[PDB]
Design a protein around this ligand. Structure first.
Ligand SMILES: *[C@@H]1O[C@H](CO)[C@@H](O[C@@H]2O[C@H](CO)[C@@H](O[C@@H]3O[C@H](CO[C@H]4O[C@H](CO)[C@@H](O)[C@H](O)[C@@H]4O)[C@@H](O)[C@H](O[C@H]4O[C@H](CO)[C@@H](O)[C@H](O)[C@@H]4O)[C@@H]3O)[C@H](O)[C@H]2NC(C)=O)[C@H](O)[C@H]1NC(C)=O
Ligand SMILES: CC(C)CCC[C@@H](C)[C@H]1CC[C@H]2[C@@H]3CC=C4C[C@@H](OC(=O)CCC(=O)O)CC[C@]4(C)[C@H]3CC[C@]12C
Ligand SMILES: CC(C)CCC[C@@H](C)[C@H]1CC[C@H]2[C@@H]3CC=C4C[C@@H](OC(=O)CCC(=O)O)CC[C@]4(C)[C@H]3CC[C@]12C
Ligand SMILES: CC(C)CCC[C@@H](C)[C@H]1CC[C@H]2[C@@H]3CC=C4C[C@@H](OC(=O)CCC(=O)O)CC[C@]4(C)[C@H]3CC[C@]12C
Ligand SMILES: CC(C)CCC[C@@H](C)[C@H]1CC[C@H]2[C@@H]3CC=C4C[C@@H](OC(=O)CCC(=O)O)CC[C@]4(C)[C@H]3CC[C@]12C
Ligand SMILES: CC(C)CCC[C@@H](C)[C@H]1CC[C@H]2[C@@H]3CC=C4C[C@@H](OC(=O)CCC(=O)O)CC[C@]4(C)[C@H]3CC[C@]12C
Ligand SMILES: CC(C)CCC[C@@H](C)[C@H]1CC[C@H]2[C@@H]3CC=C4C[C@@H](OC(=O)CCC(=O)O)CC[C@]4(C)[C@H]3CC[C@]12C
Ligand SMILES: CC(C)CCC[C@@H](C)[C@H]1CC[C@H]2[C@@H]3CC=C4C[C@@H](OC(=O)CCC(=O)O)CC[C@]4(C)[C@H]3CC[C@]12C
Ligand code: NA
Lengths: 20, 169, 181, 98, 132
């Protein structure tokens, strides 16, 4: 459960930071 | 007008680190884009070589000696608990040597050194080695009370491959 | 670059920029940086006499392959190694070593990237912010790994399994996460 | 900053402060510090002649973000793991490591 | 048209600083280099001691490569000595892994060959004073 949660949070973090 | 044809190395105090092979001098008559007239100049060209014994005994032999340890993990049994510590240690030691080699060289982005390319190569493959060894540690500690063993793994990873690798149970 | 004189002023000398762009004639290429344009302008303030100025702007691109091949690849490497301590089983005893080592490597690259950067507080670079995010994520990974390693070593003689973990973590969630015993 | 003249003294020259503050008409902001006040004052000692002085005080405030991103987040980060070694079991031998 | 006058300061060094601060931890870790083989293989601590001794030797090698001048004309005895001991520790690591692998062999995976039956049980234990 925490594997999937932290994977999803890390993907959204990389997208939200390197959007430009 | 040049007097000789080379730089004088008659009063040359020896260096001990760089050895001069040859140092010629050449006269040119060039024309700049500021000004409508010709200006002369004299160009000397030192051609030196590094004597490679201080760095091959303190930066290359330990680097090669720890880069020959990234493949030695896979002969160590999973019943022991030391498959990771070795990988983490060689990864951090290659990171420290990468710090040393980016301390020594300039930051010219024209070409890359062969030693830094070799360090990057070995770091990539040791990271792939830890992502393989976490998978084989997850495969090892696995019981029939928590997981069911499939059917295609009974033929491929247990009968087809040990006949090739010369294991034969 | 701001060229002006300290003795005389606008009431005694002019200062006429001849060409609009600085010339690029005897330029040797630097190898690390790239000059892309070199404009130049002449700044005078109306309703403020005795002011002359000729400024040249240098806009400089970087050849980025050095810092890429030496810092971006280990950055994404040690970030990719951070969602990886959860696939390792807790029956072995090598989880906390991996977690502490990933956090150690992230703090090492953060203190390294804080050296090549200038010490200004206009804005942090994206590498430092990215490593700060991943470092906070690895710290939450450490505390949830210790919490998930405590429930692995619970014996029946010292603990009693409550009915709510029976109804939650055995029936609904092993079907929600495709486990199925 | 203590301005004084080595050659002359108060029996030869006075030293009068013109404006009470220092002028910020050519200042470029450094991006690392913030000046907030630059007062100046004239200092003279009664019962001790031949002493002029003009002292400028620079009262500065630091941009707090660069040391927060580098020496506060790992400081408040590795402190949280100190009381975390007691919830770990003593069966998996990883308490001494942490 | 060539004369000069040269003085030749020949100086001996007081060695008591670098003897205590560098020679003693060097010979200490060198004394620890031959020590990982008496540890039993059942406890999972063979690799930690080997890697720790190797990393301490690389630390002292990179420390001694800083106070020395960077001349390739000759290398000191300490650098050659630490390189020799580092090669010895790396061979200790590879033979420690290869002797740790033969500790965890079971009958459900491997099968004991007759030559390792007759060699490592009769000749060498009576040769190395083991006596079962
Ligand atoms: C390290 O880096 C430096 C600079 O990058 C290199 O220096 C260059 O070396 C080359 C090779 O020697 C030089 O080229 C030579 O220039 C001489 C001077 O030129 C004058 O004379 C000619 C002929 O009249 C005029 O046209 C010119 O305007 C000058 O007035 C020439 O005399 C040389 O010619 C001789 O060699 C050629 C073959 O190469 C023969 O065919 C000719 O007949 C003649 O015998 C030659 O052309 C060059 O000038 C150097 N650069 C500078 C700036 O001086 C180093 O070579 C390099 N190190 C190494 C090891 O490569
Ligand atoms: C090239 C020199 C510096 C040695 C570098 C180490 C490795 C390339 C060698 C030395 C010991 C070898 C191992 C010794 C024992 C065997 C058992 C054999 O069965 C399979 C190969 C293997 C693992 C060898 C794989 C390659 C190893 C690790
Ligand atoms: C390090 C970066 C630059 C490339 C990463 C490549 C991975 C996407 C691939 C290469 C090798 C693959 C592994 C090859 C073998 C296995 C065993 C296999 O069984 C399960 C997948 C796995 C772990 C693979 C997972 C995905 C890996 C790591
Ligand atoms: C992509 C390469 C570089 C490996 C990076 C690590 C993870 C992103 C991989 C490694 C093992 C993979 C897992 C292997 C087994 C499965 C069971 C499978 O059923 C669901 C996906 C999952 C969790 C995989 C999800 C993706 C994981 C965690
Ligand atoms: C919300 C932020 C500020 C802190 C996040 C901490 C969590 C990662 C930890 C702290 C308490 C832990 C919980 C404590 C109790 C249990 C019961 C256990 O059974 C299942 C895991 C769980 C939910 C733990 C999951 C991980 C938790 C939420
Ligand atoms: C991030 C730090 C500052 C707080 C979270 C640390 C947790 C790993 C520990 C500290 C106190 C522990 C709790 C103390 C009391 C109990 C009651 C006990 O019954 C069950 C475990 C629990 C919830 C513990 C769960 C795990 C906790 C929250
Ligand atoms: C170098 C000194 C300061 C440290 C000593 C560590 C080893 C060199 C000692 C510790 C255990 C000793 C062994 C203990 C048992 C015996 C059995 C005895 O019969 C022969 C010597 C021997 C192998 C000893 C050889 C020397 C050993 C390996
Ligand atoms: C790094 C290279 C140059 C030297 C490494 C030496 C090993 C390649 C040799 C030396 C003794 C050999 C061992 C001697 C005894 C046996 C028991 C035998 O049963 C299985 C192979 C093995 C471990 C041998 C495997 C390979 C070993 C470790
Ligand atoms: Na361990």
């Amino acid at each position: 459960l925490f594997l999937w949660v932290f994977m999803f949070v890390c993907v959204l973090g990389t997208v939200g930071l390197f959007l430009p | 007008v040049l007097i000789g044809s080379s730089m004088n190395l008659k009063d040359y105090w020896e260096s001990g680190e760089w050895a001069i092979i040859k140092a010629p001098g050449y006269k040119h008559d060039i024309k700049y884009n500021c000004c409508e007239e010709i200006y002369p100049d004299i160009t000397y060209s030192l051609y030196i070589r590094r004597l490679p014994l201080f760095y091959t005994i303190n930066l290359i032999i330990p680097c090669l000696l720890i880069s020959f340890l990234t493949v030695l993990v896979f002969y160590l049994p999973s019943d022991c608990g030391e498959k990771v510590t070795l990988c983490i240690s060689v990864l951090l030691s290659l990171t420290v040597f990468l710090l040393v080699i980016t301390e020594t060289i300039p930051s010219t982005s024209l070409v890359i050194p062969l030693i830094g390319e070799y360090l990057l190569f070995t770091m990539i493959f040791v990271t792939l080695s830890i992502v393989i060894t976490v998978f084989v540690l997850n495969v090892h500690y696995r019981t029939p009370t928590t997981h069911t063993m499939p059917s295609w793994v009974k033929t491929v990873f247990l009968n087809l491959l040990p006949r090739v690798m010369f294991m034969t149970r | 670059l701001k060229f002006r004189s300290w003795t005389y002023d606008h009431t005694e000398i002019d200062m006429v920029l001849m060409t609009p762009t600085a010339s690029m004639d005897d330029f040797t290429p630097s190898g690390e940086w790239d000059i892309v344009a070199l404009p130049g302008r002449r700044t005078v303030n109306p309703q403020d006499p005795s002011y002359v100025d000729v400024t040249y702007d240098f806009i400089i691109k970087r050849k980025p392959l050095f810092y890429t091949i030496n810092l971006i690849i280990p950055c994404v490497l040690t970030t990719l190694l951070a969602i990886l301590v959860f696939y390792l089983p807790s029956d072995c005893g090598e989880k906390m070593t991996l977690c502490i080592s990933v956090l150690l490597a992230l703090t090492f690259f953060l203190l390294l990237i804080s050296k090549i950067v200038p010490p200004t507080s206009l804005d942090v670079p994206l590498i430092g912010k990215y490593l700060m995010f991943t470092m906070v994520l690895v710290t939450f990974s450490i505390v949830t790994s210790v919490c998930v390693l405590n429930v692995h070593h619970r014996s029946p003689s010292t603990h009693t399994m409550a009915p709510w973990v029976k109804r939650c973590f055995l029936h609904k969630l092993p079907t929600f996460l495709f486990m199925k015993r």
